[PDB]
Amino acid sequence: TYLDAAATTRVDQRVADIVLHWMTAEFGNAGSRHEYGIRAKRGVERAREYLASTVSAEPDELIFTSGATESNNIALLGLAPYGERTGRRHIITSAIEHKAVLEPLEHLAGRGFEVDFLTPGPSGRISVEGVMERLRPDTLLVSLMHVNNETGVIQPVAELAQQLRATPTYLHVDAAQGYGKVPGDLTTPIDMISISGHKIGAPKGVGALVTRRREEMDDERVPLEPIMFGGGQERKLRPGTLPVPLIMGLAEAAKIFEAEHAQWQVAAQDLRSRLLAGLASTSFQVNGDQDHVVPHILNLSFEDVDAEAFLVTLKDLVAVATGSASTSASFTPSHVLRAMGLPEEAASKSLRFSWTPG
């Protein structure tokens, strides 16, 4: 017996409700300022513990942030002073990273760090060998995204974690596009994991950063230093106050994703197959290794596609996805496909297309 209605389309109704409940509690006459304070504290700690558990981490190994952007900066710039102190100034990353990994690292490159920006080539997938080949005794950090946001191509962060964990080098993973979608990979001993709320259907303005302890090293978490100051919040790593409703929204989005992953997987792949079959006779071209890809992101090159044909098929793609999912379309910044070995004319002619089942 189902008695509910299906109002919200860009955010699951259960996520919306929890957010709303917490906001009205924050705004309303829900007890007194004190009584809500107790409630909000316990709620945040419940969220922290549940979220940490989805990556096999202890509650004290996770902080909340204002987004994966802030998580990435905290993780990467936060390691710079330790790097200067121990003479570990070599960083390895990929040239296909999101700007919230690229830019902090380009900032460090201008401050005396040596940063290697590895190019994956046409597969769009960094290889383990490619990283391990560049590994040095004084390599501070490897940063590798879990899933490329433009192409959906899954990186081998789980394999790398097993190898880097046995070294003094830290691994950071920007999992904004991987969290929830490839859960198994993030239970591996990756040192730092950045998580984005809105990527898994939570409100914008909230994220998380996992910082794992290493048992051998007395019992230290990553030796991060703060980039902001003023308050004890989030183990001093993120001072100020985050909005409690959004944090609780993040935890609910995660919980839905963990529980309904199989359903999401099937519906996303089912739509993928139908979209691909529509694209088969069009001379759009698929970018990235399709053996290593999240089911819900497709990157298409329209280099050989004339303008009128472009418009027709985009209509047909949206229409195929209708009543099954909501869709997104965006031009891909040329740098990502140039890092994948594409010539200029093609690298600036790509469309990112993704869908979220309803």
Author numbering: 2 to 359
Paper text:
DNA phosphorothioation is a unique type of epigenetic modification which occurs on the DNA backbone. During this process, a sulfur atom replaces a non-bridging oxygen atom of the phosphodiester backbone of DNA. Therefore, it has been suggested that the DndA-catalyzed sulfur mobilization is the first step during the DNA phosphorothioation procedure.
On the other hand, we successfully crystallized the C327S mutant of DndA (referred to as DndA hereafter), and determined its crystal structure to a resolution of 2.4 Å. In the crystal structure, DndA forms a homodimer in which the two protomers are related by a two-fold rotation axis, similar to other cysteine desulfurases IscS, NifS, SufS, and CsdB. In each protomer, there is a PLP cofactor which forms a Schiff base covalent bond with the amino group of Lys200. Each protomer of DndA consists of a larger N-terminal domain and a smaller C-terminal domain. Similar to other cysteine desulfurases, DndA uses a deep surface pocket to harbor the PLP cofactor. For example, His99 uses its imidazole ring to stack on top of the pyridine ring of PLP, making multiple van der Waals interactions with it. Moreover, the main chain of Ala69, the main chain and side chain of Thr70, and the side chains of Ser197 and His199 hydrogen bond to the phosphate group of PLP. In contrast to previously determined structures of cysteine desulfurases/selenocysteine lyase, in which the catalytic cysteines are all located on flexible loops, the catalytic cysteine Cys327 of DndA (mutated to serine in our study) was found to reside on a β strand. The distance between Cys327 and PLP is about 16 Å, and the distance between Cys327 and the presumable position of L-cysteine substrate is also more than 10 Å. Therefore, a dramatic conformational change is needed for Cys327 to approach near the L-cysteine substrate to carry out the nucleophilic attack.
